[PDB]
Design a protein around this motif. Structure first.
Motif, mmCIF file in Angstrom:
data_model
loop_
_atom_site.group_PDB
_atom_site.id
_atom_site.type_symbol
_atom_site.label_atom_id
_atom_site.label_comp_id
_atom_site.label_asym_id
_atom_site.label_seq_id
_atom_site.Cartn_x
_atom_site.Cartn_y
_atom_site.Cartn_z
ATOM 1 N N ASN A 1 0.851 -1.089 -0.060
ATOM 2 C CA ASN A 1 -0.015 -0.012 -0.040
ATOM 3 C C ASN A 1 0.887 1.286 0.047
ATOM 4 O O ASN A 1 1.061 1.931 1.005
ATOM 5 C CB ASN A 1 -0.982 -0.095 0.893
ATOM 6 N N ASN A 2 1.607 1.652 -0.986
ATOM 7 C CA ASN A 2 2.449 2.768 -1.371
ATOM 8 C C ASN A 2 1.380 3.784 -1.375
ATOM 9 O O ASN A 2 0.143 3.673 -1.760
ATOM 10 C CB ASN A 2 3.064 2.785 -2.426
ATOM 11 N N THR A 3 1.759 5.124 -0.994
ATOM 12 C CA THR A 3 1.143 6.309 -1.320
ATOM 13 C C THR A 3 1.887 7.373 -1.675
ATOM 14 O O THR A 3 3.178 7.455 -1.662
ATOM 15 C CB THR A 3 0.512 6.787 0.139
HETATM 16 C C1 LIG Z 1 -3.759 2.199 2.020
HETATM 17 O O1 LIG Z 1 -3.309 3.729 1.918
HETATM 18 C C2 LIG Z 1 -4.470 4.553 1.625
HETATM 19 C C3 LIG Z 1 -3.470 5.898 1.403
HETATM 20 O O2 LIG Z 1 -2.878 6.116 0.331
HETATM 21 C C4 LIG Z 1 -5.563 4.511 2.634
HETATM 22 O O3 LIG Z 1 -6.767 5.545 2.305
HETATM 23 C C5 LIG Z 1 -7.050 6.453 3.102
HETATM 24 O O4 LIG Z 1 -7.669 5.826 4.250
HETATM 25 C C6 LIG Z 1 -7.922 6.829 5.344
HETATM 26 C C7 LIG Z 1 -8.574 5.948 6.445
HETATM 27 O O5 LIG Z 1 -7.307 5.565 7.275
HETATM 28 C C8 LIG Z 1 -8.770 7.806 4.777
HETATM 29 O O6 LIG Z 1 -9.301 8.767 5.783
HETATM 30 C C9 LIG Z 1 -10.453 9.442 5.646
HETATM 31 O O7 LIG Z 1 -10.349 10.604 5.131
HETATM 32 C C10 LIG Z 1 -11.693 11.362 5.170
HETATM 33 C C11 LIG Z 1 -11.574 12.791 4.067
HETATM 34 O O8 LIG Z 1 -12.530 13.507 4.395
HETATM 35 C C12 LIG Z 1 -12.597 14.778 3.647
HETATM 36 O O9 LIG Z 1 -13.180 14.409 2.418
HETATM 37 C C13 LIG Z 1 -14.440 13.824 2.612
HETATM 38 C C14 LIG Z 1 -14.669 13.373 0.724
HETATM 39 O O10 LIG Z 1 -13.906 14.416 -0.031
HETATM 40 C C15 LIG Z 1 -15.485 14.944 2.825
HETATM 41 O O11 LIG Z 1 -16.594 14.565 2.591
HETATM 42 C C16 LIG Z 1 -15.051 15.189 4.369
HETATM 43 O O12 LIG Z 1 -15.759 16.228 4.980
HETATM 44 C C17 LIG Z 1 -13.435 15.801 4.387
HETATM 45 O O13 LIG Z 1 -13.310 17.176 3.886
HETATM 46 C C18 LIG Z 1 -12.238 11.819 6.504
HETATM 47 O O14 LIG Z 1 -13.419 12.276 6.228
HETATM 48 C C19 LIG Z 1 -12.274 10.256 7.083
HETATM 49 O O15 LIG Z 1 -12.595 10.759 8.495
HETATM 50 C C20 LIG Z 1 -13.667 10.549 9.087
HETATM 51 O O16 LIG Z 1 -13.952 9.046 9.101
HETATM 52 C C21 LIG Z 1 -13.126 8.307 10.383
HETATM 53 C C22 LIG Z 1 -13.260 6.981 10.197
HETATM 54 O O17 LIG Z 1 -13.297 6.591 8.756
HETATM 55 C C23 LIG Z 1 -13.184 9.134 11.534
HETATM 56 O O18 LIG Z 1 -12.029 8.627 12.415
HETATM 57 C C24 LIG Z 1 -13.241 10.652 11.465
HETATM 58 O O19 LIG Z 1 -13.375 11.288 12.656
HETATM 59 C C25 LIG Z 1 -14.131 11.103 10.433
HETATM 60 O O20 LIG Z 1 -15.176 10.855 10.889
HETATM 61 C C26 LIG Z 1 -16.084 11.877 11.323
HETATM 62 O O21 LIG Z 1 -16.815 12.343 10.204
HETATM 63 C C27 LIG Z 1 -17.739 11.720 9.643
HETATM 64 C C28 LIG Z 1 -18.279 12.170 8.408
HETATM 65 O O22 LIG Z 1 -16.681 12.318 7.298
HETATM 66 C C29 LIG Z 1 -18.827 11.409 10.504
HETATM 67 O O23 LIG Z 1 -20.069 10.615 9.948
HETATM 68 C C30 LIG Z 1 -18.433 10.873 11.749
HETATM 69 O O24 LIG Z 1 -19.597 10.501 12.639
HETATM 70 C C31 LIG Z 1 -17.202 11.456 12.340
HETATM 71 O O25 LIG Z 1 -17.881 12.814 13.084
HETATM 72 C C32 LIG Z 1 -10.992 9.656 7.193
HETATM 73 O O26 LIG Z 1 -9.924 10.238 8.084
HETATM 74 C C33 LIG Z 1 -8.268 8.607 3.693
HETATM 75 O O27 LIG Z 1 -9.265 9.448 2.958
HETATM 76 C C34 LIG Z 1 -7.687 7.346 2.535
HETATM 77 N N1 LIG Z 1 -7.046 8.351 1.369
HETATM 78 C C35 LIG Z 1 -7.215 7.894 0.113
HETATM 79 C C36 LIG Z 1 -6.421 8.621 -0.857
HETATM 80 O O28 LIG Z 1 -8.237 7.153 -0.011
HETATM 81 C C37 LIG Z 1 -6.181 3.138 2.756
HETATM 82 O O29 LIG Z 1 -7.147 3.200 3.739
HETATM 83 C C38 LIG Z 1 -5.215 1.992 3.030
HETATM 84 N N2 LIG Z 1 -5.713 0.872 3.004
HETATM 85 C C39 LIG Z 1 -5.211 -0.048 3.909
HETATM 86 C C40 LIG Z 1 -5.790 -1.501 3.700
HETATM 87 O O30 LIG Z 1 -4.348 0.171 4.651
#
Ligand SMILES: *[C@@H]1O[C@H](CO)[C@@H](O[C@@H]2O[C@H](CO)[C@@H](O[C@@H]3O[C@H](CO[C@H]4O[C@H](CO)[C@@H](O)[C@H](O)[C@@H]4O)[C@@H](O)[C@H](O[C@H]4O[C@H](CO)[C@@H](O)[C@H](O)[C@@H]4O[C@H]4O[C@H](CO)[C@@H](O)[C@H](O)[C@@H]4O)[C@@H]3O)[C@H](O)[C@H]2NC(C)=O)[C@H](O)[C@H]1NC(C)=O
Ligand SMILES: *[C@@H]1O[C@H](CO)[C@@H](O[C@@H]2O[C@H](CO)[C@@H](O[C@@H]3O[C@H](CO[C@H]4O[C@H](CO[C@H]5O[C@H](CO)[C@@H](O)[C@H](O)[C@@H]5O[C@H]5O[C@H](CO)[C@@H](O)[C@H](O)[C@@H]5O)[C@@H](O)[C@H](O[C@H]5O[C@H](CO)[C@@H](O)[C@H](O)[C@@H]5O[C@H]5O[C@H](CO)[C@@H](O)[C@H](O)[C@@H]5O)[C@@H]4O)[C@@H](O)[C@H](O[C@H]4O[C@H](CO)[C@@H](O)[C@H](O)[C@@H]4O[C@H]4O[C@H](CO)[C@@H](O)[C@H](O)[C@@H]4O[C@H]4O[C@H](CO)[C@@H](O)[C@H](O)[C@@H]4O)[C@@H]3O)[C@H](O)[C@H]2NC(C)=O)[C@H](O)[C@H]1NC(C)=O
Ligand SMILES: *[C@@H]1O[C@H](CO)[C@@H](O[C@@H]2O[C@H](CO)[C@@H](O[C@@H]3O[C@H](CO)[C@@H](O)[C@H](O)[C@@H]3O)[C@H](O)[C@H]2NC(C)=O)[C@H](O)[C@H]1NC(C)=O
Lengths: 51, 52, 111, 127
Positions: free
Chosen positions: A5-7
């Motif tokens: 899982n490179n980034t």
């Molecule tokens: C392999 O490697 C990749 C990276 O290259 C990795 O992908 C990344 O995974 C992480 C999870 O570990 C992802 O993180 C999430 O990012 C979103 C981004 O939010 C923004 O963008 C969205 C959509 O554009 C908007 O709607 C949003 O408002 C933001 O602007 C976050 O939203 C996520 O956080 C929520 O969910 C988490 C749990 O999943 C919570 O811990 C966190 O507190 C947030 O929850 C809150 O908000 C929710 C609404 O969003 C709400 O419903 C809840 O009640 C709570 O209040 C999360 O951090 C990241 O995006 C991925 N990146 C990419 C590029 O895909 C893979 O996961 C990895 N795979 C493996 C198997 O290792």
């Protein structure tokens, strides 16, 4: 497959152009590889030898 | 960051001094690099110094 | 942490039923078919009784039916008795690089 | 069947640090992952981090980065962990627990499967 899982980690280098590089690697490090079927490759060796 | 005896051929972490978009504000940066690609700068005890 | 939803204390008499939903976000719960539950029996450490979403670890009757529903993990329970009183957690894969769980549902079985 | 043991209770002031130790038996120490979990009086359990007996690579939950610390040794076959900045909340009991099988060619660290559990570690903190 490459199980790591490179980034991407993006930098701006020089005027108006961008360099890309492998970022902070997520998860546990694992080793990349290929996979082949032992039975069929051996049979294909068996079929090739007659030629 | 090296599993000292691992059955693994991991990639290396190093840094470098980056010339930012403006040519006279230099700044450091880092990024990983697959292990064959880099040659040590010197065949001496310069175990820190590395180059593409 | 984003604790999943869980019906806290729904229950019934022996032979009754409850329903469970473990809702997280669109990014965590349903990405892989890897869901586990843990039964905190009162007076002793937790116990392992859900694996792979739809499999039980050891030999146990498959009463607590498993189902996949994407953003939330849902499971149906039926055919209970008074001795089934215990606190049931649900856990799921939670992205880079961790797991998250719910608040725990207790079978407050009556009578 | 696997035999698993934890260290006993511990006493500190709030905001201090705690240490937990674990050592399995019934399988060779180098073949399984190790995890830790916190069991509250009824609130949802907190999963803290996962441990690899082979490598020094570990990850922790989104609550605990910069707060938790972990080390391990191979010859004696022991797993260690250390959390800093305790709270009145984490009088909750900590449980050592055995993870999934280790593979070199595919990743299995993030599998949430726990087959063998310890008997609990109860850290105590109060005003
Ligand atoms: C392999 O490697 C990749 C990276 O290259 C990795 O992908 C990344 O995974 C992480 C999870 O570990 C992802 O993180 C999430 O990012 C979103 C981004 O939010 C923004 O963008 C969205 C959509 O554009 C908007 O709607 C949003 O408002 C933001 O602007 C976050 O939203 C996520 O956080 C929520 O969910 C988490 C749990 O999943 C919570 O811990 C966190 O507190 C947030 O929850 C809150 O908000 C929710 C609404 O969003 C709400 O419903 C809840 O009640 C709570 O209040 C999360 O951090 C990241 O995006 C991925 N990146 C990419 C590029 O895909 C893979 O996961 C990895 N795979 C493996 C198997 O290792
Ligand atoms: C590319 O290519 C590559 C190649 O190269 C690849 O890779 C691959 O892949 C695959 C696929 O994925 C994978 O597979 C995996 O595997 C894993 C494991 O493996 C193996 O091994 C094992 C061993 O054992 C161990 O452990 C145990 C515990 O567990 C213990 O006890 C023992 O002892 C051991 O330990 C250690 O120690 C010892 C001492 O002496 C030593 O000696 C050793 O060595 C070690 O070290 C085995 O066992 C396994 O087997 C088994 O299982 C299976 C499955 O299940 C089956 O089938 C078989 O048969 C067996 O069985 C068992 O049991 C039964 C019961 O009944 C019986 O009957 C019989 O007889 C026997 O006994 C193996 O072989 C595994 O694990 C996996 O699986 C899993 O998962 C799945 C999903 O995925 C599921 O379905 C299943 O079921 C499973 O699960 C289970 O298990 C786990 C663990 O194992 C757990 O956790 C869970 O929970 C469950 O549980 C269950 O069971 C248990 C018991 O075991 C119980 O207790 C409970 O309760 C429940 O019931 C899979 O299969 C492989 O591995 C790989 N390889 C490598 C090298 O890496 C790749 O893939 C390609 N590519 C791609 C991309 O992919
Ligand atoms: C590759 O190596 C470089 C260093 O050669 C790593 O960057 C540096 O990582 C350290 C340790 O995480 C950072 O120090 C930490 O800073 C925080 C600031 O909040 C502090 O609280 C910690 O106690 C610690 O001192 C350091 O800042 C960072 N360098 C820069 C310029 O940010 C890098 O993480 C390595 N990459 C991998 C994947 O290991």
């Amino acid at each position: 497959t490459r199980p790591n899982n490179n980034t991407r980690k993006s930098v701006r280098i020089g005027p108006g152009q961008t360099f890309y590089a492998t970022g902070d690697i997520i998860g546990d490090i694992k080793q990349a590889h290929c996979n082949i079927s032992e039975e069929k490759w051996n049979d294909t060796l068996q079929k090739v030898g007659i030629e | 960051a090296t599993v000292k005896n691992g059955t693994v051929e991991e990639m290396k972490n190093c840094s470098f001094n980056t010339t930012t978009e403006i040519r006279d504000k230099e700044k450091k940066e880092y990024a990983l690099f697959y292990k064959p690609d880099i040659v040590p700068l010197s065949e001496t005890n310069n175990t820190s110094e590395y180059r593409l | 942490l984003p604790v999943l939803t869980q019906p806290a204390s729904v229950s019934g008499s022996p032979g009754q039923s409850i329903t469970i939903s473990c809702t997280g976000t669109i990014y965590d719960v349903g990405k892989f078919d890897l869901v586990s539950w843990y039964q905190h029996h009162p007076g002793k450490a937790p116990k392992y009784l859900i694996y792979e979403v739809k499999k039980w670890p050891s030999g146990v009757s498959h009463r607590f039916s498993g189902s996949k529903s994407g953003n939330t993990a849902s499971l149906t329970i039926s055919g209970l008795q008074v001795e089934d009183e215990a606190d049931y957690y649900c856990c799921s894969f939670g992205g880079s690089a961790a797991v998250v769980c719910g608040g725990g549902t207790k079978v407050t079985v009556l009578g | 069947q696997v035999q698993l043991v934890q260290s006993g209770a511990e006493v500190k002031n709030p905001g201090a640090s705690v240490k937990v130790s674990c050592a399995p038996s019934g399988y060779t120490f180098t073949d399984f992952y190790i995890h830790w979990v916190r069991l509250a009086p009824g609130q949802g359990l907190e999963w803290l981090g996962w441990m690899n007996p082979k490598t020094g690579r570990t990850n922790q939950g989104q609550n605990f980065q910069g707060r938790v610390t972990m080390t391990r040794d191979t010859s004696i076959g022991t797993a260690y962990m250390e959390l800093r900045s305790l709270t009145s909340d984490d009088t909750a009991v900590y449980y050592c627990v055995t993870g999934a099988w280790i593979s070199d060619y595919y990743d299995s660290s993030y599998y949430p499967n726990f087959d063998h559990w310890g008997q609990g570690t109860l850290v105590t903190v109060s005003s």
